[PDB]
């Protein structure tokens with residue numbers, strides 16, 4: 001996030017996970033969220049998690065049957081310790097995933113603000129030029145209907161304004177990209193809020209299950225032991241479902257993060273020029289800005305307009321008592337236009353947008369991927385804890 | 400960060416904590432890190448924690464004496480649960496404080512990069528203009544020692560180059576601010592890494608102390624119980640020291656975070672112009688820029704020089720077969736200077752620097768202050784856990 005984006009070792013490893021599709025068919029592991037084969041590979045990872053959950057349940061049933069048909073305190077304490085470690089790791093991973101999601105949201109909002117500002121500046125300058133300059137120049141022409149030189153100067157000012165308007169219209173329009181960014185930010189906020197809440201409820205339920213199981217064991221209550229066995233089975237189901245979700249999300253995120261610029265270029269094509277997208281995506285210092293010529297022509301037109309207006313003031317104003325207010329209004333408009341041009345040349349610069357892109361990449365890849373990995377670790381630990389507790393169940397019942 | 404800065408409720412609360420010094424005389428709570436009254440106020444905040452530790456030890460020893468002269472399993476399990484909770488909260492606080500410190504270092508490095516780039520642009524443009532433009536114009540004058548008009552054009556180009564150099568020299572120089580930023584970033588990295596390692600070691604020591612206490616209780620070893628009592632007393636002392644450090648650091652950070660712009664303006668009084676500092680600190684689109692006139696003059700001089708060079712090319716290439724290479728070199732130099740002007744006007748813009756400032760504020764205040772409060776909570780939790788463990792120790796020793 002400081003110089004460039006390099007795919008971390010964990011991103012590379014997760015991307016290395018084979019994508020197999022439902023019927024064990026090799027699937028191309030390039031981020032294609034809209035591709036049926038890619039979605040099938042993610043579903044296959046989820047299905048492998050489901051098969052592992054089924055194996056866990058089968059082993060638990062076999063062990064319970066063998067124990068009933070055919071240490072307790074220490075196994076209970078070990079299960080409680082593993083559950084506490086799992087809940088701590090889950091809290092950490094949940095917070096890290098929330099941090100990554102909020103970093104992505106912040107980068108999307110910053111890019112949205114920059115693009116909306118570019119659009120507002122271009123629209124405001126265009127409206128100012130056309131409407132206000134035309135009105136003031138019409139008034140000045142009506143008051144100056146005696147001097148061919150002055151009329152020609154007004155015509156030159158109008159022509160320069162037209163050139164400025166053409167250049168401004170030649171800049172990218174970011175309305176569609178801004179709508180996409182706002183929609184993505186809203187969806188990310190919604191989904192992240194509900195994911196964080198769901199994992200927090202899972203941690204609370206696991207902690208209460210562990211504490212209630214310990215209390216039931218202390219009080220020697222068959223009702224409490226059976227209720228905690230049922231809750232442990234339900235939490236084992238939830239833990240395996242969570243591990244499936246975390247593994248699939250980690251593999252998809254790693255697929256994206258292994259090559260994010262390729263996906264951005266692929267998905268933006270047709271709505272953003274390749275040169276503009278590459279300018280914002282690579283922000284190479286030794287490179288030519290796609291907007292440099294537009295900005296140069298805009299500022300040259302503004303400079304010529306100001307020179308003409310200053311000459312018109314210093315000459316005509318002594319000759320004509322009136323018409324000074326219109327010239328002053330035009331000069332103020334051009335001063336505002338120069339300020340707007342400086343703001344626009346600052347906004348269209350690749351540095352800020354590339355910083356937003358790199359911050360989003362850092363958030364997603366580093367923070368979010370690590371949070372998803374820690375949530376998968378929590379899921380595995382909770383499965384292990386609620387499996388060992390269920391295994392010790394029958395022995396505790398007997399003794 | 401995502402918006403402007405407003406002091407959070409916990410920042411306001413912590414800043415409200417009374418500042419009294421060693422003699423209890425009232426002390427101004429404004430952030431003055433170099434002021435003896437303020438440093439003494441922080442020292443008193445630490446001395447309060449030292450007195451609390453003394454009272455805790457007094458109570459522990461009194462209870463131990465009374466029990467020896469005049470529930471064990473459940474108290475031990477409760478102490479172990481509280482120690483696990485404290486270590487979890489401490490892990491969260493350590494991670495959050497590290498995140499805040501790293502965010503501050505990231506903002507400092509981004510501001511350092513921006514200011515260093517501004518300095519590089521200004522220095523390179525100045526050197527290019529004077530050295531290269533003057534050498535090329537001298538060669539052109541030597542090759543054009545026949546045309547008074549062409550000599551006057553070369554003189555005009557030299558005068559415009561001098562104007563550009565003067566305008567560039569009128570901009571702020573960020574060498575001192577950059578050196579201060581690098582020093583602060585390096586010190587922050589050093590202190591943060593060592594603090595994080597210290598708290599990780601403390602968490603691991605607490606965990607091993609609790610686990611070995613439980614193991615010694617299981618094995619019914621008197622030596623293990625005595626060793627765990629001694630290590631629990633040592634960890635209680637470390638926890639009280641950590642609480643004192645966290646409380647003092649949190650109060651100081653809150654004092655800063657209440658008036659960050661005021662502190663920055665005070666501390667940058669003699670090294671940065673007040674208008675420049677306020678421009679970067681407040682970044683209001685309503686107001687003007689302290690560099691707008693400089694940039695406008697720079698670009699107008701560039702445009703005049705470009706027009707002169709183009710006219711000279713057009714009206715002298717047919718007349719003079721030579722000098723074409725020198726004219727093309729000057730034109731390329733001016734093209735590069737236009738690119739540098741656009742880069743500079745994007746760099747000096749307040750948006751990026753204000754984003755860096757607000758991100759450092761978000762990091763420090765929100766993340767670091769929350770992490771410090773969590774570390775203080777961990778310290779109190781560990782003190783409570785080890786106090787309960789020591790209190791329950793005598794019963795196990797007798798049993």
Ligand SMILES: CCCCC/C=C/C/C=C\CCCCCCCC(=O)O[C@H](COC(=O)CCCCCCCCCCCCCCC)COP(=O)([O-])OCC[N+](C)(C)C
Nearest residue numbers: 022023036037039040041042043046244245246248249252
């Ligand atoms: C939250 C974690 C992050 C990632 C989450 C997972 C991402 C994907 C989730 C669902 C996306 C919809 C998938 C539609 C296309 C599937 C691939 C495909 O259509 O290819 C098909 C998959 O087979 C199918 O039955 C069609 C698709 C069945 C979809 C089943 C939907 C289950 C939904 C449960 C998932 C719950 C969470 C997600 C809910 C939306 C391959 O054809 P075949 O081999 O089976 O035919 C073989 C024919 N012989 C044998 C004669 C040769």
Ligand SMILES: CCCCC/C=C/C/C=C\CCCCCCCC(=O)O[C@H](COC(=O)CCCCCCCCCCCCCCC)COP(=O)([O-])OCC[N+](C)(C)C
Nearest residue numbers: 186187190191194195198199202238239241242245246249
């Ligand atoms: C056992 C532990 C498991 C924990 C993880 C799984 C728990 C659920 C997590 C998220 C569930 C989605 C949120 C509730 C469903 C709302 C749908 C609805 O109702 O339709 C709509 C559509 O929503 C959406 O825009 C987003 C579409 C959500 C569909 C995505 C399904 C796949 C999710 C994959 C999750 C990957 C990350 C997890 C990896 C750990 C909800 O209303 P709305 O959006 O139109 O209103 C507000 C309008 N805005 C959003 C603009 C403000």
Ligand SMILES: CCCCC/C=C\C/C=C/CCCCCCCC(=O)O[C@H](COC(=O)CCCCCCCCCCCCCCC)COP(=O)([O-])OCC[N+](C)(C)C
Nearest residue numbers: 431432433506507510583665666676679680752755756759
């Ligand atoms: C984007 C910028 C990066 C993020 C900026 C936001 C927070 C930066 C760090 C704030 C906490 C620093 C804690 C220092 C504790 C030691 C104090 C000390 O002892 O020596 C400090 C000096 O050393 C520092 O302060 C380091 C300064 C670091 C900032 C350098 C300028 C940054 C802003 C540039 C201008 C643009 C405006 C901002 C937008 C970029 C003196 O203060 P004094 O009162 O104690 O002595 C009294 C002596 N007089 C009276 C002369 C002050």
Ligand SMILES: CCCCCCCCCCCC(=O)OC[C@H](COP(=O)(O)OCC[N+](C)(C)C)OC(=O)CCCCCCCCCCC
Nearest residue numbers: 022023024043044046047048049050051052053240241244
């Ligand atoms: C908890 C999350 C719930 C969501 C899970 C959603 C799962 C997807 C639902 C639809 C899929 C479905 O119904 O299964 C459909 C497929 C059937 O295709 P086939 O194998 O190729 O059989 C036909 C054979 N042909 C097509 C070649 C002719 O399954 C399977 O037989 C997959 C068999 C391979 C299993 C390998 C698993 C190895 C596990 C290793 C553990 C370490």
Ligand SMILES: CCCCCCCCCCCC(=O)OC[C@H](COP(=O)(O)OCC[N+](C)(C)C)OC(=O)CCCCCCCCCCC
Nearest residue numbers: 042043044045046047049237238240241242244245246248
């Ligand atoms: C044994 C599993 C226990 C865990 C269950 C967790 C909650 C499940 C649903 C609760 C919310 C709900 O109410 O479901 C609804 C939601 C959305 O779908 P929708 O109904 O069509 O909303 C739109 C249609 N509307 C508007 C008419 C309702 O579904 C989900 O996206 C939840 C997916 C849970 C995935 C967990 C494992 C994922 C494995 C992925 C491997 C590839």
Ligand SMILES: CCCCCCCCCCCC(=O)OC[C@H](COP(=O)(O)OCC[N+](C)(C)C)OC(=O)CCCCCCCCCCC
Nearest residue numbers: 033034107108111177180267277280281353354356357360
């Ligand atoms: C600064 C560099 C230039 C940036 C230009 C703006 C790019 C906007 C990207 C819109 C993505 C989109 O379109 O939505 C995202 C799509 C929607 O899902 P989908 O429908 O299945 O995919 C569409 C497939 N189609 C087209 C075949 C139907 O995929 C995703 O959800 C994953 C989004 C990954 C996060 C990307 C954020 C990268 C950080 C950027 C911070 C500035």
Ligand SMILES: CCCCCCCCCCCC(=O)OC[C@H](COP(=O)(O)OCC[N+](C)(C)C)OC(=O)CCCCCCCCCCC
Nearest residue numbers: 009010085089246247250370372373374375376377380381
């Ligand atoms: C063992 C019982 C559980 C212990 C729980 C507490 C400690 C957990 C690990 C701490 C060490 C650590 O933090 O590992 C650090 C790593 C990497 O991060 P890095 O340090 O910045 O990279 C440093 C790289 N070097 C060293 C080369 C410079 O983090 C992670 O990628 C997430 C680790 C969790 C992975 C769990 C797998 C989940 C799989 C499920 C989905 C497939």
Ligand SMILES: CCCCCCCCCCCC(=O)OC[C@H](COP(=O)(O)OCC[N+](C)(C)C)OC(=O)CCCCCCCCCCC
Nearest residue numbers: 432433434435438500586587590591594648651652655763
């Ligand atoms: C998690 C880590 C976050 C960052 C923590 C960085 C701490 C060290 C940074 C500067 C170190 C330094 O400069 O130490 C040197 C400084 C001053 O220097 P002096 O030469 O002695 O001044 C001469 C002495 N006068 C000024 C009296 C004449 O000593 C101190 O002020 C000691 C008290 C500072 C502790 C609290 C200040 C910062 C609190 C945090 C508010 C955000």
Ligand SMILES: CCCCCCCCCCCC(=O)OC[C@H](COP(=O)(O)OCC[N+](C)(C)C)OC(=O)CCCCCCCCCCC
Nearest residue numbers: 441442443444445446597636637640641643644645647648
């Ligand atoms: C306001 C209330 C605060 C409460 C106290 C909180 C901690 C304050 C920090 C002071 C830092 C300092 O004292 O200095 C840090 C010291 C001195 O470094 P040095 O020997 O000179 O370096 C050598 C010169 N080199 C750098 C060139 C090589 O480093 C140390 O080795 C001590 C580390 C102690 C770590 C464990 C803390 C023990 C605390 C015990 C309390 C019961």
Ligand SMILES: CCCCCCCCCCCC(=O)OC[C@H](COP(=O)(O)OCC[N+](C)(C)C)OC(=O)CCCCCCCCCCC
Nearest residue numbers: 084087088091407409483484487488491769772773775776
């Ligand atoms: C084994 C068991 C492990 C348990 C681990 C527990 C981790 C808890 C993670 C939950 C995160 C969360 O709930 O949010 C943490 C919250 C939300 O802050 P925010 O959302 O980030 O932003 C700010 C959003 N406001 C503005 C709405 C708040 O912070 C806070 O309000 C700050 C309060 C800090 C309390 C610290 C204790 C104070 C008393 C001690 C003083 C010395």
Ligand SMILES: CCCCCCCCCCCC(=O)OC[C@H](COP(=O)(O)OCC[N+](C)(C)C)OC(=O)CCCCCCCCCCC
Nearest residue numbers: 081084085088089092483484486487490494497595606610
């Ligand atoms: C009784 C068995 C308990 C086992 C507990 C093991 C904890 C040891 C952690 C070592 C990992 C490490 O080395 O660091 C700690 C790791 C990694 O942090 P990070 O993201 O990389 O920070 C980066 C900082 N840098 C950049 C400077 C490197 O944080 C975690 O994984 C979260 C663990 C949650 C707490 C787990 C237990 C909490 C309750 C325990 C009750 C039993």
Ligand SMILES: *[C@@H]1O[C@H](CO)[C@@H](O[C@@H]2O[C@H](CO)[C@@H](O)[C@H](O)[C@H]2NC(C)=O)[C@H](O)[C@H]1NC(C)=O
Nearest residue numbers: 108109112113115116117178181182183185186
């Ligand atoms: C992204 O920027 C757009 C503007 O381009 C914001 O859309 C405006 O939102 C405000 C506040 O809700 C409305 O009053 C305006 O009417 C909206 N304008 C348009 C053109 O839609 C949008 O809120 C921003 N999104 C995010 C997530 O920050």
Ligand SMILES: *[C@@H]1O[C@H](CO)[C@@H](O[C@@H]2O[C@H](CO)[C@@H](O)[C@H](O)[C@H]2NC(C)=O)[C@H](O)[C@H]1NC(C)=O
Nearest residue numbers: 507508511512514515516577580581582584585
């Ligand atoms: C802040 O930027 C300065 C440049 O202004 C960096 O200083 C350079 O560091 C490199 C790498 O160590 C050296 O080769 C250069 O000689 C340094 N230049 C100067 C002028 O000192 C500095 O490293 C940056 N600091 C941080 C923390 O990123």
Ligand SMILES: CC(C)CCC[C@@H](C)[C@H]1CC[C@H]2[C@@H]3CC=C4C[C@@H](O)CC[C@]4(C)[C@H]3CC[C@]12C
Nearest residue numbers: 009010011012013014015016017018250370373
């Ligand atoms: C540790 C985190 C960060 C990364 C994920 C680690 C695990 C789950 C991943 C990373 C790399 C993966 C391996 C990559 C390549 C292969 C070869 C293939 O023929 C069988 C699967 C196998 C052997 C994968 C198994 C799962 C694997 C070990």
Ligand SMILES: CC(C)CCC[C@@H](C)[C@H]1CC[C@H]2[C@@H]3CC=C4C[C@@H](O)CC[C@]4(C)[C@H]3CC[C@]12C
Nearest residue numbers: 017018020024044045046048049247248250251
């Ligand atoms: C992050 C988590 C979910 C990763 C889990 C990786 C699992 C799904 C991967 C790792 C190794 C993979 C196997 C590697 C090789 C083969 C042999 C091939 O002839 C059929 C597919 C099969 C049998 C793969 C199935 C999927 C597999 C088991």
Ligand SMILES: CC(C)CCC[C@@H](C)[C@H]1CC[C@H]2[C@@H]3CC=C4C[C@@H](O)CC[C@]4(C)[C@H]3CC[C@]12C
Nearest residue numbers: 408409410411412413414415416417768769772
């Ligand atoms: C995040 C924060 C809120 C964590 C907890 C901070 C607590 C300990 C702080 C915040 C505000 C503080 C109070 C602010 C003002 C006063 C009035 C004074 O005459 C006695 C102390 C007293 C009553 C302080 C006691 C400590 C206090 C309650």
